[PDB]
Design an enzyme around this catalytic site. Structure first.
Site: not given
Ligand code: CL
Lengths: 93, 141, 4
Positions: B29-30, B130, B88-89
């Site tokens: 997701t954005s 994350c 993100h991560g």
């Protein structure tokens, strides 16, 4: 004579190991909001670890998630300072 | 001699990697609101006299090339190095727009080994991502 | 608020 190759790194994580990190689509992420506020207020006053500790407190106390999904509602976050630094870090002078 | 020498001619680079839009093929997701972060960080580190470079929507290949190139710059007149990663991560991993990058791979470019100009100088990695899928329910005070 |  030598120093460790891993010395003098600091990892300022937004969240604890194994955990989601929270972002607000209007205000930005909880961690970055708090980091910038505390750098703004204290970079001319406190050593970096003490700045980052104020960030921990701000994220831990002033934020709690609001979600229509019960699974993600009313959740909390603590950032995670990982210091391999060998000296104190001050941004001034 | 208990504090890092921060009176070199320059405070140093602050590299901000702001990944908001990911390739559809990844299924990610954005990250709405990350532009607010990136602008906040730019202003904040500007006021600390860092040479801020904002990078947006970098692939995994571009992240690695950027880190490689930056680690090879002349840091002799720079007091420190800062990298901010917004993406993100998961644990040990941050995502380029098309796939993951091991955090170790990024930071290894700056190891006291591979970037002699930053030996003994503080290398700060600020990571909004994350680290897993656990949720903290908190506890009352 | 969103996880990310
Ligand atoms: Cl945004």
């Amino acid at each position: 004579h030598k120093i460790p190759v891993e010395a003098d790194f600091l990892y300022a994580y937004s969240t604890a190991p194994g955990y989601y990190s929270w972002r607000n689509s209007k205000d930005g992420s909880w961690f970055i909001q708090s980091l910038c506020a505390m750098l703004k207020q204290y970079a001319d006053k406190l050593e970096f670890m003490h700045i980052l500790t104020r960030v921990n407190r701000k994220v831990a106390t002033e934020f709690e998630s609001f979600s229509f999904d019960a699974t993600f509602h009313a959740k909390k976050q603590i950032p995670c300072i990982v210091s391999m630094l060998t000296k104190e870090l001050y941004f001034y002078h | 001699d208990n504090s890092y020498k921060m009176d070199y001619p320059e405070m140093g680079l602050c590299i901000i990697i702001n990944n908001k839009n990911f390739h559809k093929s990844t299924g990610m997701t954005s990250r709405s609101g990350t532009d607010v972060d990136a602008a906040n960080l730019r202003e904040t580190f500007r006021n600390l006299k860092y040479e801020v470079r904002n990078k947006n929507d970098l692939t995994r290949e571009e992240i690695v090339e950027l880190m490689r190139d930056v680690s090879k710059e002349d840091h002799s007149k720079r007091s420190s190095f800062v990298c901010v990663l917004l993406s993100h991560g998961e644990e040990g991993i941050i995502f380029g727009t098309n796939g993951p990058v091991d955090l170790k791979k990024i930071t290894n470019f700056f190891r006291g080994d591979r970037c002699r100009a930053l030996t003994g100088k503080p290398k700060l990695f600020i990571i909004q991502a994350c680290r897993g899928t656990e949720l903290d329910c908190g506890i009352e005070t | 608020d969103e996880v990310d």
